[PDB]
Amino acid sequence: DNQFYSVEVGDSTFTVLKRYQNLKPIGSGAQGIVCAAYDAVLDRNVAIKKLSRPFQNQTHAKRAYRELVLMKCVNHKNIISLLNVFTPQKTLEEFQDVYLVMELMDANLCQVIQMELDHERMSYLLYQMLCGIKHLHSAGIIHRDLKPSNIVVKSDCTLKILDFGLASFMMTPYVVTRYYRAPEVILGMGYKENVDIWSVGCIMGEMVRHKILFPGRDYIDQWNKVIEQLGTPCPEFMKKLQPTVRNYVENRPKYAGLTFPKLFPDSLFPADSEHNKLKASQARDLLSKMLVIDPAKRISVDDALQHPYINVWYDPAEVEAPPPQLDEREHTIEEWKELIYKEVMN
Ligand SMILES: CNC(=O)c1cc(-n2ncc3cc(Nc4c(F)cccc4Cl)c(CN4CCC4)cc32)cs1
Secondary structure, three states, X not given: OOOEEEEEEOOEEEEEEOOEEEEEEOOOOOOOOEEEEXXXXXXXXXXXXXXXXXXXXXXXXXXXXXXXXXXXXXXOOXXXXXXXXXXXXXXXXXXXXXXXXXXXXXXEHHHHHOOOOOHHHHHHHHHHHHHHHHHHHHOOOOOOOOOHHHEEEOOOOOEEEXXXXXXXXXXXXXXXXXXXXXHHHHOOOOOOOOHXXXXXXXXXXXXXXXXXXXXXXXHHHHHHHHHHHHOOOOHHHHOOOOHHHHHHHHOOOOOOOOOHHXXXXXXXXXXXXXXXXXXXXXHHHHHHHHOOOOOOOOOOHHHHHHOHHHHOOOOHHHHOOOOOOOOOOOOOHHHHHHHHHHXXXX
16 A cells, blocks of 8 residues: 555665665765665666755755755766655655665775776776766856765776765764865865866875875865975965965965875886886876866866876767756755755655
């Protein structure tokens, strides 16, 4: 009779449509754990995420709404697309939880980062991250918080970005990973498209180094790590800083910054064949153009896609997809509950 059934998964209750069978945990993270399942209607493995009362506060509310709305503005194989959205609640009044369903993938990008990867796979993951980003930007979406824990891959080396970035405070123990954020974001500057190239550079760099490039308890520690390694930015970069942030960054110790062979020595790269020796120097060259503090000197998404490290994968039908609601206003719980509910059933 009921379309739904409930099963305890790790600790959470999943109330899902009966088409989804054999639920099992695959990890948690931020708002809501996720489960793998077999979808008996489509005869394929899916991943199901529970948003628990996403209207309970503005942080959870804004991004649940945002991501439901933005889902319909993108259509690209390196960007999440949902297979199903449902609530087991029957009315706005009883409405509580949202479930999102997508293709089951094989691994998060964090796991892939810990592997020794050839150049063909590294360059292909990067190519795909750049294609996704480009799709987002062409749709008017600038991410600003790309990070590996929100990127997933299949065994065939294919890759999907799962979130849409920045639009705060939550009483939960959940903690925000900030290490992949551009200087523009760390320092509250204007930004444009290539804010996201920085994050691609932090990921690429960590794939080679197998350590977070710019760790830290908060932006104070993080900024220090940026300047220690890349050096103090030029005066031209300083003039773009708001007067108070500007005074702070100019009074930090001036650092020369290490060269990019020093920051990513040859020992980190496969370099046994001539082919691999060349790919190493191409990898480092691209890194040196992405990990650039000043966005006015940082390479763009389009030029990074033409870099020799990356463009061996270039296909016109992959980079230029056809492009295609705005509410970040402060709402109460009630407004947000109805806004999300409506999107859930359109
Ligand atoms: C044997 N396979 C495995 O072990 C693995 C497979 C996965 N995988 N595949 C798809 C997927 C999706 C998300 N979330 C999600 C969802 F589930 C449904 C709709 C929208 C979204 Cl955003 C998560 C959770 N991650 C992302 C940060 C925590 C992991 C995911 C990774 S490991």
